[PDB]
Amino acid sequence: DEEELNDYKLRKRKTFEDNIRKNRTVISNWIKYAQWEESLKEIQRARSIYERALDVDYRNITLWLKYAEMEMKNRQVNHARNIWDRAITTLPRVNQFWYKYTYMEEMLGNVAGARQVFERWMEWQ
């Protein structure tokens, strides 16, 4: 695992970088880069990746989604909650954001928090 693996990483990384260099619009390359990272388990890398992608297009429901999906599958539950509240702050009229926020809060048990986030939510009727 010294350098054959490491150079395979170097290659795939340089590729994804060049594809997003060409477009840096449509996001499938951003995602696939990031999920490749998460599968190699470097969530710091993958984190910066999702922040940059979110910069170029902060109106992407799937981007927000799979960002937080990474955070939840890796249970940085605090990090995940920060993600969810930022989401529902910037794209409130998207509903599945609110939903997944609650559902995760519920299997977390903090139903006081779930109540107050539903109060938030209903402020938008």
Partner 1 sequence: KAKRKAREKQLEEARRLAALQKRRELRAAGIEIQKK
List of residues contacting partner 1 (CB under 8 A): 3-4, 7, 11
CB of 96 to partner 1, least distance (A): 39
d(CA 57, CA 53): 6
Q: Smaller CB distance to partner 1: residue 4 or 123? A: 4
Which is closer to partner 1, CB of 17 or CB of 57? 17
What's the closest the beta carbon of residue 28 comes to partner 1, in angstroms?
A: 20
Task: Work out how close the CB of 19 gets to partner 1 at its nearest, in angstroms, rounded to a whole number.
Answer: 15
Long-range contacts made by residues 21-24, C-beta under 8 angstroms, separation at least 24? 24/56
Nearest to 33 by CA among 62, 53, 60: 53
| Residue carrying structure tokens 């939840």 | 72
Instruction: Return the number of the residue (14 or 115) whose C-beta is nearest partner 1.
Output: 14
82 vs 99: CA distance, rounded Å = 15
Smallest distance, Å, CB 36 to partner 1? 18
Closer Cβ to partner 1, 3 or 55, answer by number? 3
Where does 41-94 have alpha helices with state H? 43-56, 61-73, 77-90
